[PDB]
Amino acid sequence: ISVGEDFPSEYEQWLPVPDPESRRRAGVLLHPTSFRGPHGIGDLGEEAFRFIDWLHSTGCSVWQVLPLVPPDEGGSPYAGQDANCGNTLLISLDELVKDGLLIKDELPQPIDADSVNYQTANKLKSPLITKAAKRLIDGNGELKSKLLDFRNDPSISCWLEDAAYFAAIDNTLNAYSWFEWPEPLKNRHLSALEAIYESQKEFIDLFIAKQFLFQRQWQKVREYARRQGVDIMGDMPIYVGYHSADVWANKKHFLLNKKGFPLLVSGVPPGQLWGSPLYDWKAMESDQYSWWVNRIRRAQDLYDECRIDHFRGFAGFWAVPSEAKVAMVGRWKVGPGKSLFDAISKGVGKIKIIAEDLGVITKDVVELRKSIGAPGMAVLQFAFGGGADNPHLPHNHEVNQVVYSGTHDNDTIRGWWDTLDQEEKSKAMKYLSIAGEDDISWSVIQAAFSSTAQTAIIPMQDILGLGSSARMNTPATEVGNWGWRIPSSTSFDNLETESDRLRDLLSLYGRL
Amino acid sequence: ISVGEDFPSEYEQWLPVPDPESRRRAGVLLHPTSFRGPHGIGDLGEEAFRFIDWLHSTGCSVWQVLPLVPPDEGGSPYAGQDANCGNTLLISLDELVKDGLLIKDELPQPIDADSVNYQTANKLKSPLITKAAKRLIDGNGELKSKLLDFRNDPSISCWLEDAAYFAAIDNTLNAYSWFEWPEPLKNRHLSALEAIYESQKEFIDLFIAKQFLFQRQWQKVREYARRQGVDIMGDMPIYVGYHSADVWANKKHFLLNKKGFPLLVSGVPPDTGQLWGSPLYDWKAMESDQYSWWVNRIRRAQDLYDECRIDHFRGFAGFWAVPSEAKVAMVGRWKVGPGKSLFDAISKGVGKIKIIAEDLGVITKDVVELRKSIGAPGMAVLQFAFGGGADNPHLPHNHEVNQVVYSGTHDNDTIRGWWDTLDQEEKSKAMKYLSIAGEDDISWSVIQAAFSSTAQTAIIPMQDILGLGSSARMNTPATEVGNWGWRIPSSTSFDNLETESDRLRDLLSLYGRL
């Protein structure tokens, strides 16, 4: 331990050791609504456990889902009805039979499983979920006791009670938004809230019970994933909906006017007017960002890791006067920056956050992302426009990054290939290793696996080699999204070939 | 500049900007001895300038050479005769004509040399280099004046005078090494040195003049490379030869005994071992004068090159030391090297440096840590990537940005030759990772994998661009004969390599290395 002197006996064994936090891996993007089954939509029953087995058999160690919130009427998990609740339509009816909350003969006749129609699924399943929730509350055994534990839990009630009351009042009143509610409900006068509890007690207890059932079923999926070596990566939009408990029960955390209407709403310039209310970050700074801390605590309860959509909003955000009809007349505002993430980590511990950072982004975004150690994204479908500086080209990938073939907002690789621009196609053929065009999804999968990016994620549609009809979402259309389901005859038992082929790629590129 | 407040008007223009220090690039490994021409060996004349034009036409921005020192009798640039001098056999005779130091009709008749024979080259060129050097010293114009500037320059003379005297004494005395010299020469008694100057003055002045001529020609190549957008990457072995001015004129900087013989010599352990037999540095001693010897060595490397690789870089963190009596390497111990304090001293003395770490083989965690602490890139070599498993660091998916990727180096066979003798297990593995067409084009498959890497710098040997087989291998380690001789085929001019240039350029454009 001194210049010129002898080193100890075993110097040549002092070899470099790979950092375990740098381990290369792969995963599949599959939302549970796409699982097969008889009730109009996928669920957290037997298909979720079979998927986990299949995924593990491939050597993948990550399962990514879309947000698990209650979606809008079109099915969108990004315009959810609450930021912290689970989508009750994902509750398995068959799992309720095993709990004794339904009996086998109460299960409905199967319906055709081509695509999720959310109206059909709700009509079919909700009466029975309600019925099961009713039996749960009227019992007084182990299960009822676990409901009480759930309900009385401080880290459940800080979002659950607000969510239940909001939903009771929305049920009782015929109003567009809570801005049109009568004043003592609009502004949460204590006695009105007690009058809501009394007059809507049964709806409130059932809402809570249903959230318990979702939690139960999701936590068993998550425990089985952990046993099989699978991390689950969730998703959350940066902004929440105006008509929600999140805003209604925390008005001072948002930029509302004295009458509770948003002064400013979200979007991006030339433009796109998303119309979500905006956070009062200065205000949140006061109480050490407790709202956002809570949101992450719940994300952590649901997921091992979590992507945040429009992450750039944490450094700077586009703000449009709520009167406006289009986005072009806004200004950029300063975001909370790292101090937000300091507060989170102090409140909840070490977090694994993924930054959605697509499109044009400014230097503060990159700097913020890097300062908290969060990986960004590369999407191979975006790599062949422009020149060789395109950051989605594999030679421009980074280690701390998630590479996708595409996301739920893109066509499948097959579909994209079919409509691809001639200029972009010839470029793609130079860079990728392409055999037959039927196998084009595997060419792209292989490029993703061959990247230096630490994490490679592939949508289930591309593993199945499906075309445009299996596209999950097309942005800026309002109908025909969120509907894709795995073809009814394609069981996980019948996907050994695909599993073996993935495993071979993972092994070749050091992702096992 | 406050949370919730407005950003200025032009926020969306505050876009990320590529750091120029991160620019991806490519280059060719070609030693100047390999250039074509009539005088038995390549030189710093017309072919060096034509190569630079060709290289620039490919879009490459780096030229890597082997060390430019006076080689051993076998031609090895790694067992050189001096660490700081240039190989005078690289001097272009035709460039001397343009200086007026030779006249046109004094140029010799062409000879055939499909490969460098060093003895033939020396016999043909040296009389004329000597003659030019003589005319230089007998003149008294601009050129003579530039020689004086060169000679009197403090950063030349700290190595040049020692190098000239050493060589004069070696010339005059019939001795194996300087260890067998008579005592006052061995130990550099001042009066003996003055007696050497007076009795060997002509040899000393001509030695200095020849070093001036090499410097002149090398600096003209280096200026033309700079004008065409080409950086030149040199090479330096970590250790120097015992029989040299480097050791003789600096004994206190090496681990010698009282009679000036090495106590310990270089090598590496088993995996008997490898006994290189070079003398070792007295790092604690060098610490005392702030590593002035190494600072000077780098100052000279900087004068010759934009960037420099250092062979056996691991030696700076730990080195294998064998008792000089020994017949094999197995009976040594590992010793602690200077670490970053050496590089602190360098940077303080010479400024910002661009060093490449040769870091091949088994290396310890202190090596990686040292390399990373000074920001030096290491190496990946694609020919080593297909043994073992998917954690092999030479596989492209395990490459790093701050790294130099090669197809192979001068110590490896060409890609074609390597492919021919490749193990069946390794070949099938290679065919799964690489994109291979016909075996005649295997060098381009490997070139393309190199260019596709995230490594910032990709370097290809000229032999692989020409798609040549094992006969064009530059060096085979642990053979002593038939190395260093490769030359570009006499009929393959740079004018005839537009197809290859276009094909390289297309790969560089596809992978963002232009």
Numbering used by the authors:
A (entry chain A): 59 to 328, 335 to 576
B (entry chain B): 59 to 329, 334 to 576
Q: What does the study report here?
A:
Because only glucose and maltose are exportable to the cytosol, further enzymatic activity is required to prevent the build-up of maltotriose in the chloroplast. This role is fulfilled by disproportionating enzyme 1 (DPE1),4 which is the plant plastidial isoform of 4-α-glucanotransferase (EC 2.4.1.25) that is found in all kingdoms of life, although it is referred to as amylomaltase in bacteria. AtDPE1 forms a homodimer with a deep, long, and open-ended active site canyon contained within each subunit. The canyon is divided into donor and acceptor sites with the catalytic residues at their junction; a number of loops around the active site adopt different conformations dependent on the occupancy of these sites.
The AtDPE1 crystal structure reveals an elongated homodimer some 120 Å in length. Each protomer contains the canonical (βα)8 barrel fold expected at the core of a GH77 family enzyme. Ser-60 is the first residue that can be clearly resolved in the electron density, and the ensuing segment up to and including Glu-79 forms an extended arm that embraces the opposing subunit in the homodimer and makes a significant contribution to the dimer interface; the buried surface area totals some 2,000 Å2, as calculated by PISA (available on the PDBePISA Web site). In the LF structure, the central portion of the gate is disordered. In all cases, when the acceptor site is vacant, the end of the gate is disordered. The conformation of the brace is essentially unchanged between the LF and MA3 structures.
